[PDB]
């Protein structure tokens, strides 16, 4: 009953991009047709939760890598690239980290978390989301424990530490609602990343978590070039999904990446609609029967060359 298809990963590489990827983890790989679809159609996998802080360091200095190892091992078995993260994020943070008020203590904790995770997989990981969701909607920095205890230097320090732990990895800052050039948040992240790179922070990429509502794909055609103007080596579309999964929206986002030389690829936030955090809007590229949806076939048509 499986349908004939083409790999969007193979097609996007033929157009000069690095990958078309997907978020997943052990329980998805064990169920449905996820592993088979990822094997056939996607070239990079990202851990949805198994590399988050609550999963990997549930108490200080006590690391748990079972779920992360599963994904890394599966990807290597199956010839897939691997992305990791998020290393520094206020969500899915254990309470013991929020307990800390001493600046030097939290710095050491953050640096240890980054170094331990990145060293375990040194040379194996294409890219790490070093800092995620650091900005408020108005463009100011989000008042997380890291900002409140360490200050603004937590971002410089996090990236310097990551570069040392694995110099081969691409180091990303990531955020959401960067989907319109008109947003104060989009302009602010660009301004701050330019200034951070002038301060020597090794921010290799900006990753735009592109959770779109219907019709918002068109806006990414202007938002992504604006993000590229920060001058980072790379940008990327991360955690893509689209309410309604209209082919027009999905093709607009793909074309945004094709239009930007620093865009290295696109990652979709899961395989099949029923597993989406917004499943009721059927926002992914495969349906509940694990068959490719019209948007998948529209991407395929757009990437033919």
Numbering used by the authors: -1 to 303
Paper text:
Here, we investigate the molecular origins of the nearly billionfold rate enhancement achieved by directed evolution of the computationally designed Kemp eliminase HG3 (7). The Kemp elimination is a well-studied model for proton transfer from carbon that has served as a benchmark for de novo design. Although the first-generation HG3 design is significantly more efficient than an “off-the-shelf” catalyst like bovine serum albumin, its specific activity was further increased 200-fold over 17 rounds of mutagenesis and screening. All HG3 variants have an inactive conformational sub-state, rooted in the original protein scaffold, which was gradually supplanted with a catalytically competent sub-state as evolution progressed.
To disentangle the catalytic contributions of M84C and K50Q from those of more distant mutations, we introduced them singly and together into the original computational design. K50Q increased HG3 activity only 1.5-fold, in marked contrast to the 40-fold loss in efficiency seen when Gln50 was reverted to Lys in HG3.17 (22). The maximum likelihood X-ray structure of HG3 K50Q shows that the Gln50 side chain is properly oriented to hydrogen-bond with the TSA, but it shows significant disorder in the ensemble refinement, as do Asp127 and adjacent residues. Similarly, M84C provides no catalytic benefit to HG3 on its own. Together, however, these two mutations boost catalytic efficiency substantially, increasing the rate of the chemical step ~30-fold and overall catalytic efficiency 10-fold.
